[PDB]
């Protein structure tokens, strides 16, 4: 039984398999991946600053400790200081958790986690450590600074968020949702993207708030060749409030990033890779999203490479408002073999899009023939590793120029196997079917989710002067029969319009497309499923979604009435929609397992999937796209937050079921990633044990050049902004 805000000692750890994909790379391709990976791991440290006030200190303390003494050496000291093997293991798991999440908050769930041992016992280990003997001042200093917050589980520190009842470093501690809304209106008016920005509010002597929008860049207040960002660097007046646009956020870190990006540029395969890197450098040096947009523009044209990569402030999941981006970056080898079926899905994607429950007027003008490859991840820096990605997030690029889809093949392989004894909330007659097809089912789901899901739908946009990207005279809204009366104006994006629900809303739309189009035989045939096996995959895919809808209650916060994980909230909604259809399709039954503790069961009538589930899902999917395309945020919130409402209403009683979900929950696996070392000319791949100590070791050897320098940098950046929280 897992404990909230605590990583269990027996937490699953899997090492990313990357030996074969790396063994195929040419010397130049290896050197290319080597420097790109270093750029990713460098910038990945910025996530610490984007997580919690104490996260940079904790990483600095852990890095110091394990540099002087590896887990086996530190074991001998810790056990001599009174720590049991269990208590020491708890510290190893915590450290590995901080490393893999780049912070003391889970990327998947946004909950704080603390070390599972006495604080006074860990103190003796740290103060008596070898790192403390070599540098007593900075070790005692770090422990004094982050020690309290390392263990504290005060209610306002338990979850990420704005307001006084949450923690965030995207904003200063005194910021609220009202502040975030005012900032977004200012940002939209200046056509300034929020992706690489943070917001800080300081009050003057009077008490009047002053707002600072700090951009992420190497350069600061000093003049430079750029004018696009330079001209923006000034004070503003917005609705009575004074705004100031600055830059230089994570400056020494991004400095390390552009160094490795520039070195990787000398090993680029083509001009597409060469120009996109130069633009990323421009973006990270100047603070220009446009420069990153220009880079992404070249990146999309780099069709089916050998080493695929992407880097920057990409996703906006962990921003409580939902517009600011968390830094990430990945380097992967395109698995030509597994990428065959995905290109096959693209080849018939244009016709598949027509099967979607909305008129072509709400679909993109032209099918853009996007790249879709199966990837073997070498490096995925940041807070967490996804199963698949649809990028870039710039919708003006995806609806006009193009986009890319990637399925992380060596990531799917981790959760491919299934243990029957650890299955939860499933009927016994379904367990064998679930095990046999769970793997293959999400492989199809990932493909549809990214390509047919994220890659579908048009946004109605009106430019600054009249002209609509659609024809308002002919286009009619299906749900009302009237002409379009709502759209996106200039400067408005998906994230700016729907804000706090933008992520989850879209994932719900994407997940729904996946389920809906998994009924189509030609889709399953592409992934190699026909006849009896085909309907089995369908049944399991729907069984999984309904099951996941129940598991999702783990990621809901009752006292705040707030969902913490977008994809999980999305699956709970779909569960609710299928429950709403009735007809005995889906039922949730509170039971009592052999454990003796409260349990639950989920039943899904296979025969009523196409007759009841599909039309209900088709109705729901139509509503989603309509409100999305028109930017009807009021209707969107009315529709989505309705199904996303968690209550103890009969017969389900979700609030009571939530307690059962938490009681039988299983922690998500930590993933150990390999390292690449350069022996002057040749590049080698270092692998590690699939354990906490193995994950720790992977970071100890991750920065052999300037490790202690990064600790100092992260410490400096943290102290500089300490007054904010």
């Amino acid at each position: 039984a897992d404990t909230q805000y605590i990583l269990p000692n027996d937490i699953g750890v899997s090492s990313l398999d990357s030996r074969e994909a790396f063994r195929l790379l040419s010397p130049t391709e290896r050197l290319y991946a080597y420097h790109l990976s270093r750029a990713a791991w460098y910038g990945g440290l910025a996530v610490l600053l984007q997580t919690s006030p104490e996260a940079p200190y904790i990483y600095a303390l852990l890095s110091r400790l394990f540099r002087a003494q590896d887990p086996d050496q530190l074991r001998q000291h810790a056990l001599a200081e009174g720590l049991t093997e269990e208590e020491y293991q708890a510290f190893l798991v915590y450290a590995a958790g901080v490393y893999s999440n780049m912070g003391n908050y889970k990327s998947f769930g946004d909950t704080k986690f603390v070390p599972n041992l006495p604080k006074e016992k860990l103190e003796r280990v740290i103060l008596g450590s070898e790192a403390a003997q070599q540098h007593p001042e900075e070790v005692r200093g770090l422990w004094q600074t982050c020690g309290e917050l390392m263990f504290s589980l005060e209610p306002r520190l338990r979850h990420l968020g704005l307001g006084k009842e949450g923690i965030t470093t995207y904003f200063s501690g005194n910021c609220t949702m009202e502040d975030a809304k005012l900032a977004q209106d200012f940002l939209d008016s200046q056509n300034l993207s929020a992706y690489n920005t943070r917001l800080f509010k300081e009050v003057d002597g009077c008490g009047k708030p002053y707002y600072e929008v700090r951009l992420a860049s190497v350069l600061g207040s000093e003049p430079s060749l750029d004018s696009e960002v330079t001209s923006k660097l000034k004070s503003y007046e917005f609705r009575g409030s004074p705004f100031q646009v600055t830059r230089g956020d994570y400056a020494p870190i991004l400095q390390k990033v552009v160094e490795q990006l520039e070195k990787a540029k000398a090993y680029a395969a083509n001009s597409h890779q060469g120009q996109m890197l130069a633009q990323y450098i421009e973006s990270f040096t100047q603070g220009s999203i446009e420069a990153h947009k220009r880079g992404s523009r070249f990146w999309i044209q780099d069709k089916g490479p050998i080493v695929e990569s992407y880097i920057g402030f990409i996703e906006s999941y962990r921003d409580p408002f939902g517009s600011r981006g968390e830094f990430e970056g990945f380097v992967a080898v395109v698995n030509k073999a597994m990428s065959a079926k995905f290109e096959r899905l693209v080849a018939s994607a244009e016709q598949l899009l027509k099967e979607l429950p909305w008129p072509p007027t709400f679909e993109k003008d032209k099918f853009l023939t996007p790249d879709f490859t199966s990837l073997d991840v070498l490096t995925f820096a940041g807070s967490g590793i996804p199963a698949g990605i649809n990028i870039p997030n710039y919708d003006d690029l995806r609806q006009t120029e193009g986009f890319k889809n990637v399925s992380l093949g060596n990531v799917l392989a981790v959760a491919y196997a299934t243990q029957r004894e650890k299955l939860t909330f499933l009927e016994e007659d379904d367990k064998d079917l679930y095990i046999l097809w769970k793997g293959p089912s999400f492989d199809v789901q990932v493909g549809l989710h990214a390509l047919l899901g994220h890659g579908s739908g048009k946004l109605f946009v009106q430019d600054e002067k009249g002209a609509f990207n659609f024809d308002q005279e002919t286009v009619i809204n299906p749900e009302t029969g009237e002409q379009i009366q709502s759209w996106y104006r200039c400067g408005e994006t998906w994230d700016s319009k729907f804000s706090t629900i933008a992520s989850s809303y879209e994932e719900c739309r994407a997940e729904s497309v996946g389920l809906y189009l998994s009924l189509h035989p030609q889709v399953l045939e592409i992934f190699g499923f026909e006849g009896a096996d085909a309907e089995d995959v369908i049944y399991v895919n729907w069984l999984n979604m309904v099951r996941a809808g129940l598991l999702a209650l783990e990621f809901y916060t009752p006292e705040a009435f707030n969902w913490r994980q977008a994809h999980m909230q999305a699956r709970f909604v779909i569960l609710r929609v299928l429950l709403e259809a009735g007809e005995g399709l889906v039922t949730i039954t509170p039971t009592t397992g052999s454990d003796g503790r409260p349990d639950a069961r989920v039943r899904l009538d296979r025969s009523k999937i196409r007759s009841v589930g599909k039309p209900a899902l088709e109705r729901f999917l139509r509503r989603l796209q309509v409100l999305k395309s028109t930017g009807d945020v009021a209707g969107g919130r009315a529709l989505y937050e309705g199904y996303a409402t968690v209550t103890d209403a009969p017969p389900e009683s979700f609030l009571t079921l939530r307690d059962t979900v938490l009681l039988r929950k299983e922690s998500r696996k930590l993933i150990v990633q390999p390292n690449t070392r350069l022996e002057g000319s040749d590049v080698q791949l270092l692998e590690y044990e699939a354990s906490a100590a193995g994950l720790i070791r992977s970071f100890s050897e991750r920065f052999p050049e300037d490790g202690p320098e990064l600790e100092e940098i992260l410490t400096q950046l943290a102290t500089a902004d300490a007054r904010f929280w």
């Binding site: 996804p386 199963a387 990605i389 649809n390 990028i391 959760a415 879209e506 598991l551 998500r668």
Partner: peptide
């Protein structure tokens, strides 16, 4: 936009 697998 990202795609996730749960449980993982």
């Amino acid at each position: 936009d990202r795609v996730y697998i749960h449980p993982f």
